[PDB]
Design a protein around this ligand. Structure first.
Ligand SMILES: NC(=O)C1=CN([C@@H]2O[C@H](COP(=O)(O)OP(=O)(O)OC[C@H]3O[C@@H](n4cnc5c(N)ncnc54)[C@H](OP(=O)(O)O)[C@@H]3O)[C@@H](O)[C@H]2O)C=CC1
Ligand code: SF4
Ligand code: SF4
Ligand code: SF4
Ligand code: FES
Ligand SMILES: [Zn+2]
Lengths: 123, 80, 55, 47, 57, 117, 68, 692, 123
């Protein structure tokens, strides 16, 4: 693995103190769309002193962390890993979580009760 | 003071330690009633025991072994 | 990055009783919490003094 | 003012940058679309 | 030229804190915090424009 | 009006300037920041300055409470909030309020309360 | 240029034909409060001060002790 | 066992009898919808998923049309695009112009599908206009604005099926149909803040997060939920110094998309009564102080008291990090005193079951395994309150299958059907001998849940004796391929504490301490700490436990730190830090690492990776994040937990009590929040909550 | 632009490690020949052997780099830096970027231990 962190122009502080995270974005519980859940995002863990603080004056969110808004998209997981250790970065990788396939029937809703009903559907 | 050791669950280089578990747990507990035992398991782990003496001094051995009397010997060695 | 070199710490209490939590890293856009009045800041000493103070 | 020059320092902002790219669509917005490949330059289906 | 927050007839602040002016602003001059007030009406607690980074689009 | 200046110093402002507006003295949001709060926080820079030419622009929460309540005989009350001297589309989007519960139901854009009678 | 009334300011710059005493009752906007007209106080000590409209975002604890 | 068909030219194989929408999701084909959901029943209300099917005259609803072989499905038919525009325009006619004031601005399903599939313009311009629906006060947690409802039945299907609260419903015909309680009845359930992520439009929405923020502004962060037994997955949305809401990301094992009420609405107490500076007691008054002041006061008081051994108590509490427990255990044992206890009553001794053999104190069947259950019984617990997601699991498996329940303890009001057995250990042993030896011996996949509320009972070892004898004697409950003895643990810290070995010895329970350390540890009483003792409280916000202290030290809460957490199942999971600790709070292991230097202890780590290495030295199943291992030691562990309390503890006739008094205020954050404060009073037994 | 600048070099990439070592040593000679015109040109406080120790230190940063392409990109960046410094294009404020250490003492309270890093939480 060639070490490109000396020829990128990035400081040594970023490659030696900052840990970064590769993750695939979760499907939102809000809406039924799944489009932003395919690319692998690369995202920096926050610094606890440098993350954000409110201003004296008006209360603007001021920051000294500069990688807080940078976020990368990759097609592949191995793309993100190859780029991340090619730039010499400490990374954690988060495995995705898909839904378990369960067979659904509409005729499931009204099957015959032999004993206690134990449920009342509505529709 | 207390002692803890680490296995891998599937039979790669830890079955002699594992039957040393299954027959010598109850013997070791009344051998040392003062002393707690922690046994822990995960698929990738080399069989290792740590023991913690008083004021936070601990040390470890590796259990690259093929005999129950041998791990017996190793934990004999380490509690001293 | 920048750092508070004038401060021994972050959280500084003054003797009057005021609690002062310094914010952020060092440098221009952050605040230590102290309020200072420099008389004669026009002066030859005072220009350097409040240059080092407001830094 | 001490060195009487401009100095270059590590960066710090009075208002942090807020990107609103987080908050894009969750439905894929455009279809695949049609082709304008001519029938001269695509592979023949057999038979 | 400069900015103004208008009011209704019979004096009501008009800003229902929909964050649209903040979402569209090409130079990120708008900053708003919004809270539900005592009436249950939706208003801005905080509205702010930096006129040094405003571009008059 | 004397407020403590984080040190036991009490600083003194006229009481016409501790009101949120000349309509209402108290604050109308749970994070509205009282005028005593603001002046307690940064009076380092209200020094040598006139409090008179500060804006003071007339809180609307009580300018909406003195408007009369409209009465509708039907079931639903229509609202746009437009003027009808202005050539164009002003006011808010047109929303329809149900007036069935006891009391007055307010428009969520303008605040004009409607009641069924 | 800051000392001209707003309705007149649009007229001086050739925006409107009809001067703001010439316009009828229908164009004059309805208000429930008085008008006062501050021109501009730049360099004047009545210059504007900006501040935080809201209180600090995270509360701190009121110290409460207890004798056990 | 499978069926192969064609959607859009794609050829797809799916299990027999499934839905056509599941075939479309398997083939990658995007089909829009409004009243279909994975964890809910199928309804054909919203008419959005119409699809072109060969050998069908009309476009069929893809969510309730079952899969058949030889099937040719088209979604890009001109008829299907026309049908989607038609049904969209039909939906939009009575839906009010509330998009600048609706809370689902960039998160509205209706709105994002109206661009992609709906009509450009609108023809709705009558004088008579849209209908208007009366607002319906449900409760204090759910804001309810029902002009913008589309009648997707989804809330009603959910509170019918899974939440077990049948108070919701649909009352009326035509446009005068409404979705609410008909009487204006208040809705309780243990998960009622989950209906507001479920509604696709903003008709049911968040009340403390009414109009505060806006989804294109929010920064999302994937963390782990403390103040829950199961340790569910969340989604922290942050403006950046403040925290707005948590919202569940999916995991089919730990929470199955559905999350606790108490987990959700405790973001209010995250930011209201926080410790931002260290404080030193002068005597009947605190003062706030310097770090050197507080930590040197701790060092000077250690040199003044001089506890030589077994007198430095260090008790942790409900929510702590595993790494902070590493720091605390290492500091006390390099001090020379394992007076190292847990917070609960009867926490001063070994908790009547083995720290030995992890399967003693864990939920040993998988949380995914309860779905396979046949006939299960619980002792001493209320799974409706503690791990309210496990109640959804039990009611869900009981609804789909033939499941048999009984309970030993207080008479609980389950969502599901329990049988009663008694209020006595004699009632227990009688029920084990009489009916359910036969039932649990007959059953294939039974299990037994043990609450940790009876672990905190002084008569615990009799219960563990009787259940260990039964599980060892019965070969069906305990065999090779699955394990059936199971326990629940109330707090997120108890499983990690029992992993690390955070429990006292028999010698350490005898002495009275001169210096007590509270790391969290909020439910201590006044009588539990001695009056001469120099106690110091390290915690993130002010509490009962903060009031007793001579020094308090602010810590980072679970949002502000990246942390390892272990649940009842045994999963190690990391929380990502969303924001930073405000004012002057720091990270919990770094504070202990710094106090050690003013004592005589140099802890061997000084960085986060060395904390991870020391954690792997404790046990390597805590660097193996979100994996579950089996146990080969299930036979040996039940015997080893049988031998200990055999005859040592006599079963007394004290009745089995309820573990928690209320649901809503049980730890340091939930007691600080005004949301739980005004929630526990409105979710007390009133006429608005009586079913009558 | 057919005529090029005075201290130009056509950028050329070496297939051998040793010919790049030849070019690197020639570059070091060019830098240290030009240290007195850098001291006169940028009106500096100090004397010429501090320019010379900085040139040597900036070369001992990159001594144990193995990969030949990364050493080629490093040599090209270094020759561009020499061409900027010798032609008086960089100004004194960016010439003194190289000396952040020398201009002043930045103050007291340099955090060395864990605790004085902790008392200001790394500031
Ligand atoms: N050789 C030296 O330089 C020495 C200086 N000092 C002392 O240090 C202090 C500052 O020295 P330095 O900075 O070098 O010289 P300065 O020029 O600064 O001394 C005058 C400073 O104080 C202000 N000043 C003088 N009189 C008044 C007055 N009646 N009202 C208001 N302001 C006034 C001046 O205002 P303005 O700027 O408008 O002129 C100016 O800021 C002096 O006290 C000096 O005695 C100590 C030993 C030797
Ligand atoms: S927040 Fe901005 S865009 Fe929205 S109504 Fe107010 S002024 Fe208009
Ligand atoms: S739910 Fe309806 S009113 Fe609210 S934003 Fe979405 S489309 Fe607009
Ligand atoms: S209340 Fe919400 S989820 Fe339920 S049917 Fe109405 S819009 Fe749908
Ligand atoms: S989701 Fe298939 S019709 Fe409503
Ligand atoms: Zn209106």
């Amino acid at each position: 693995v060639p070490a490109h962190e000396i020829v990128s122009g990035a400081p040594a502080e970023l490659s030696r103190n900052r840990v970064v995270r590769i993750y695939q974005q979760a499907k939102p519980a809000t809406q039924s769309g799944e489009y932003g859940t395919f690319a692998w995002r690369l995202d920096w863990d926050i610094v606890d002193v440098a993350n954000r603080w409110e201003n004296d004056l008006i209360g603007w969110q001021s920051s000294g962390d500069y990688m807080q808004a940078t976020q990368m998209k990759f097609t592949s997981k191995e793309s993100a890993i190859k780029f991340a250790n090619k730039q010499g970065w400490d990374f954690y990788i988060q495995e995705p979580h898909h839904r378990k396939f369960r067979v659904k029937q509409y005729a499931n809703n009204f099957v015959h009760s032999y004993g206690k009903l134990k449920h009342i559907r509505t529709k | 003071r207390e002692i803890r050791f680490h296995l891998c669950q599937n039979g790669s280089s830890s079955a002699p330690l594992r039957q040393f578990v299954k027959n010598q747990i109850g013997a070791f507990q009344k051998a040392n009633p003062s002393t707690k035992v922690l046994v822990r398991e995960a698929n990738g782990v080399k069989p290792i025991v740590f023991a913690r003496f008083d004021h936070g001094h601990e040390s470890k051995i590796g259990l690259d072994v093929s005999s129950e009397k041998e791990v017996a010997e190793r934990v004999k060695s380490l509690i001293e | 990055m920048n750092s508070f070199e004038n401060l021994a710490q972050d959280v500084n209490i003054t003797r009057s009783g005021k609690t002062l939590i310094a914010k952020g890293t060092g440098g221009r856009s952050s605040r230590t919490g102290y309020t200072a009045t420099v008389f004669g800041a026009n002066g030859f000493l005072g220009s350097y003094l409040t240059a080092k103070l407001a830094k | 003012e001490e060195k009487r020059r401009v100095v270059y320092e590590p960066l710090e902002l009075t208002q942090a940058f807020r990107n609103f790219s987080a908050g894009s669509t969750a439905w894929e917005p455009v279809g695949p679309g049609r082709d304008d490949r001519p029938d001269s330059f695509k592979l023949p289906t057999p038979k | 030229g400069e900015h103004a927050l208008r009011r209704y007839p019979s004096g009501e602040e008009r800003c229902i804190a929909c964050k649209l002016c903040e979402a569209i602003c090409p130079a990120l001059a708008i900053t708003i915090d919004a809270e539900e007030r005592i009436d249950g009406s939706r208003r801005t607690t905080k509205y702010d424009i930096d006129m040094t980074k405003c571009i008059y689009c | 009006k004397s407020i403590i200046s984080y040190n036991g110093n009490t600083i003194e402002i006229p009481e016409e300037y501790t009101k949120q507006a000349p309509n209402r003295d108290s604050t109308w949001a749970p994070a509205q920041a009282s005028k005593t709060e603001i002046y307690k926080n940064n009076m380092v820079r209200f020094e040598q300055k006139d409090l008179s030419k500060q804006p003071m622009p007339y809180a609307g929460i009580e300018l909406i409470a003195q408007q009369p309540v409209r009465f509708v005989h039907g079931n639903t009350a229509v609202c746009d909030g437009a003027n009808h001297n202005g050539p164009g589309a002003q006011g808010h989007p047109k929303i329809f309020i149900n007036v069935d519960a006891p009391g007055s139901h307010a428009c969520q854009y303008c605040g004009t309360r409607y009641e069924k009678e | 240029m800051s000392q001209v009334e707003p309705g007149w300011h649009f007229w001086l710059g050739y925006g409107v034909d009809t001067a703001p005493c010439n316009t009828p009752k229908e164009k004059l906007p309805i208000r429930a409060y008085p008008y006062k007209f501050q021109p501009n106080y730049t360099g004047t000590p009545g210059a504007f001060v900006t501040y935080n409209t809201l209180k600090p975002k995270i509360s701190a604890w009121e110290p409460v002790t207890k004798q056990r | 066992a499978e069926i192969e068909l064609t959607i859009d030219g794609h050829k797809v194989s799916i299990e027999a009898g499934s839905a056509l929408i599941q075939a479309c999701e398997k083939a990658g084909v995007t089909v829009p919808r409004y009243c279909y959901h994975d964890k809910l029943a199928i309804a054909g209300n919203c008419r959005m998923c119409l699809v072109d099917v060969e050998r069908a005259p009309k476009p069929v609803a893809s969510c309730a049309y079952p899969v058949a072989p030889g099937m040719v499905v088209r979604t890009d038919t001109e008829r299907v695009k026309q049908a989607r525009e038609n049904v969209m325009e039909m939906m939009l006619q009575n839906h009010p112009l509330d998009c600048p004031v609706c809370d689902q601005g960039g998160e509205c399903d209706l709105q994002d599908q109206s661009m992609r599939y709906g009509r450009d313009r609108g023809r709705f311009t009558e004088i008579t206009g849209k209908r208007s629906t009366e607002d319906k006060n449900i409760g204090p947690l759910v804001k309810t604005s029902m002009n913008r409802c589309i009648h997707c039945t989804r809330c009603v299907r959910f509170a019918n099926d899974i939440a077990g609260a049948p108070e919701l419903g649909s009352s009326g015909r035509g446009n005068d149909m409404q979705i609410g309680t008909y009487l204006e009845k208040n809705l309780n359930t243990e998960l009622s803040g989950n209906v507001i992520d479920l509604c696709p439009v903003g008709a049911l929405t968040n009340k403390p997060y009414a109009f505060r923020a806006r989804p294109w502004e929010l920064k999302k962060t994937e963390s782990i939920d403390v103040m829950d037994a199961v340790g569910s997955n969340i989604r922290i949305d942050s403006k950046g110094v403040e925290v707005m809401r948590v919202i569940p990301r999916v995991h089919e094992d730990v929470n199955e998309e559905w999350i606790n009420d108490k987990s959700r609405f405790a973001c209010d107490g995250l930011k209201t009564q926080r410790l931002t500076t260290p404080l030193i007691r002068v005597g009947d008054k605190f003062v706030n102080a310097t770090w050197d002041d507080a930590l040197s006061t701790i060092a000077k008081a250690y040199q003044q008291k001089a506890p030589k051994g077994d007198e430095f108590k260090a008790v942790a509490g409900a929510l702590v990090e595993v790494e902070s427990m590493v720091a605390l255990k290492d500091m006390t044992n390099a001090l020379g005193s394992e007076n190292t206890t847990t917070d609960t009553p009867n926490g001063n001794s070994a908790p009547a079951h083995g720290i030995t053999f992890r399967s003693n104190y864990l939920f040993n069947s998988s949380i995914a395994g309860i779905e396979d259950a046949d006939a299960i019984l619980l002792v001493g617990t209320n799974p409706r309150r503690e791990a309210a997601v496990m109640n959804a699991r039990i009611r869900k498996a009981w609804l789909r299958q033939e499941l048999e329940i009984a309970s030993v303890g207080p008479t609980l009001d389950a969502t599901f059907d329990v049988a009663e057995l008694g209020n006595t250990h004699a009632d227990l042993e009688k029920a084990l001998s009489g009916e359910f030896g036969e039932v649990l011996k007959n059953a294939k996949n039974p299990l037994i849940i043990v609450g940790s509320g009876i672990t905190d009972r002084e008569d615990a070892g009799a219960f563990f004796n009787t259940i260990g004898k039964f599980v060892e004697s019965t070969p069906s409950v305990l065999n090779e391929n699955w394990n059936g003895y199971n326990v629940l643990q109330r707090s997120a810290s108890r499983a990690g504490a029992y992993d690390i070995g955070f429990t006292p010895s028999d010698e350490a329970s005898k002495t009275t301490p001169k210096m007590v350390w509270l790391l969290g540890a909020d439910e201590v009483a006044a009588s539990d700490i001695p009056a001469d003792a120099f106690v110091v409280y390290q915690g993130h916000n002010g509490d009962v436990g903060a009031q007793f202290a001579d020094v308090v030290l602010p810590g980072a809460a679970y949002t502000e730190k990246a942390g390892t957490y272990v649940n009842t199942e045994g999963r190690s999971q990391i929380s990502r830090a969303a924001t930073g600790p405000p004012g002057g709070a720091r990270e919990d292991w770094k504070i202990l690492r710094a106090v050690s230097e003013y004592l005589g202890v140099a802890l061997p780590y000084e960085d986060a990776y060395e904390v991870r290495d020391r954690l792997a030295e404790i046990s390597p199943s805590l660097v193996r994040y979100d994996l579950v291992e089996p146990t080969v030691f299930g036979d040996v562990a039940v015997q080893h937990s049988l031998v200990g309390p055999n005859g040592s503890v006599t079963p007394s006739s004290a009745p089995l009590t309820e573990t928690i008094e209320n649901f809503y205020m049980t730890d340091s954050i939930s007691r600080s929040s005004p949301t739980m404060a005004k929630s526990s009073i409105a979710f007390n037994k009133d006429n608005k909550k009586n079913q009558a | 632009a057919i005529i090029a600048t005075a201290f130009a070099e056509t950028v050329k990439f070496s297939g051998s490690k040793q010919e790049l070592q030849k070019r690197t040593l020639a570059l070091y000679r060019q830098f240290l020949r030009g240290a007195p015109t850098f001291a006169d040109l940028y009106e500096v406080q100090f004397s010429i052997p501090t320019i010379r120790t900085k040139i040597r230190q900036e070369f001992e940063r990159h001594r144990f780099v193995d990969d030949l392409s990364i050493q080629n990109v490093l040599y090209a960046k270094g020759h561009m830096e020499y061409q900027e410094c010798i032609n008086a294009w960089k100004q004194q404020a960016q010439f003194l970027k190289y000396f952040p250490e020398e201009d002043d003492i930045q103050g007291r309270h340099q955090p060395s231990n864990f605790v004085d890093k902790f008392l200001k939480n790394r500031a």
